Amino acid sequence: PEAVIVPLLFALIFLVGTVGNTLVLAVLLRGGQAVSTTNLFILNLGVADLCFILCCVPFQATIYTLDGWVFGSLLCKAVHFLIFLTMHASSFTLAAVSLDRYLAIRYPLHSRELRTPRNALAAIGLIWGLSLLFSGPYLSYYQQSQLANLTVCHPAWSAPRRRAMDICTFVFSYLLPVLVLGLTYARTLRYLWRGSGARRAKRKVTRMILIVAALFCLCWMPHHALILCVWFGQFPLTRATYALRILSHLVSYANSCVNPIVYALVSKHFRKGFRTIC
């Protein structure tokens, strides 16, 4: 039952997210859109972050569904390094996109000199460097080992330092980006609300901002919540706990699955650019 539906769910999420990001690739690369700060930000986020994380999803689903690690030793570190590199890249890039939205909404005129595509590229480079810096230790935070008759790619790292590293990942990957997103979108919504078409446009913008914020919050909440429950509470091992872990992984992947749709695939302008590709 579960062993039949779990791989199907993982594969379905992989396929839908990958195809959405593939349309993102096509439109943002060969769609005729010139280089710009907005286009550069969604290009970076969608293409790099989402394609990388979604390609790395099966390499972690194999932990639950193949009952054996067969990727060797170099992959055991490199794949998870990439996974958390994309975790941090997604967090920082969403925060940067929210800040850019605030800059272009509050200051549509004076920011034109500031939102230069060169500055956007510099910001993308800076956030990628930061993601690499905060994701570096996971090259040794996991390791392959031989336990009993099984070979497993598991955390091989001291618990007193593993807890600290998990806390650092929680505070830097989640807490700061979510806080920045919430504050910036709150300021944007406050400024926007102070004919019928204008009211409809403002309502649609508010709805989109709210859904983006709630999306980024609630998708990455469960995994870090489970980690904190492990390291500061009694987490038993039961079929319900396994189901909860699978649900947390599924929502974590659904985050990256739905980022390109919500950010990009919903506007008429984006599909107008898409029309050129076909």
Partner: peptide, 14 residues
């Protein structure tokens, strides 16, 4: 159920 791989992945060494 909790496969040994999943248990070792969640709990690490133990």
């Amino acid at each position: 159920n909790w496969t040994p791989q999943a248990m070792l992945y969640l709990k690490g060494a133990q």
